[model samples]
Target: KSQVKIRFFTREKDELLHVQDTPMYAPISLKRYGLSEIVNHLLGSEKPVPFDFLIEGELLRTSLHDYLTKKGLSSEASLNVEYTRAI
Candidate 1:
């Protein structure tokens, strides 16, 4: 099993509904963890909403594992993830 620590960032308005800087430590994979699912949990919402992820200063639209592998990011590196409700 692999483990990576991720730091999260969100806006103030969203902070009222979500955790501001909760970092996650676990194996990175869709089956293991979905970025959208994280957003849903953070917002404390039952109804689902679209969310976009920012990693390595680029918009992420693929599997978390693939993105990390393609970017050549190491597990030891801290992933600074910024998310927002999709427009």
Candidate 2:
């Protein structure tokens, strides 16, 4: 039930998809889908865009807590996740 601080970023040079560079706390139980929902919410898109996340150069295929455990990262660790359109 621990929460982790996450900062989101996009490599796409498009301004429309860029989110504010602010740290937000999310429950570690959230998966890629949940993270995508958050990003879409931030974007305030009329049609939600599907996104994929990269953490530490690897795609996130599991829950945030699982990834943290596999990487030996604590809940207190702040993560920077790069997101891109899923294509």
What candidate 2 gets wrong by more than 4 Å, as runs, is none
Residue-level lDDT of model 2, residues 1-87, one tens digit each, is 499999999998879899999999999998889999999999998899999999978999989999999999899999999999984
TM-scores of the models, in the order given = 0.72, 0.95
TM-score of 2: 0.95
lDDT of 1 by residue, 1-87 (tens): 377788777553754445557677746665223776776776787687667777756777766666678878877767887666774
Q: Model 1: runs farther than 4 Å from truth? A: 11-17, 31-33
Q: Clashes in model 1: which pairs? A: none
lDDT of 2: 0.93
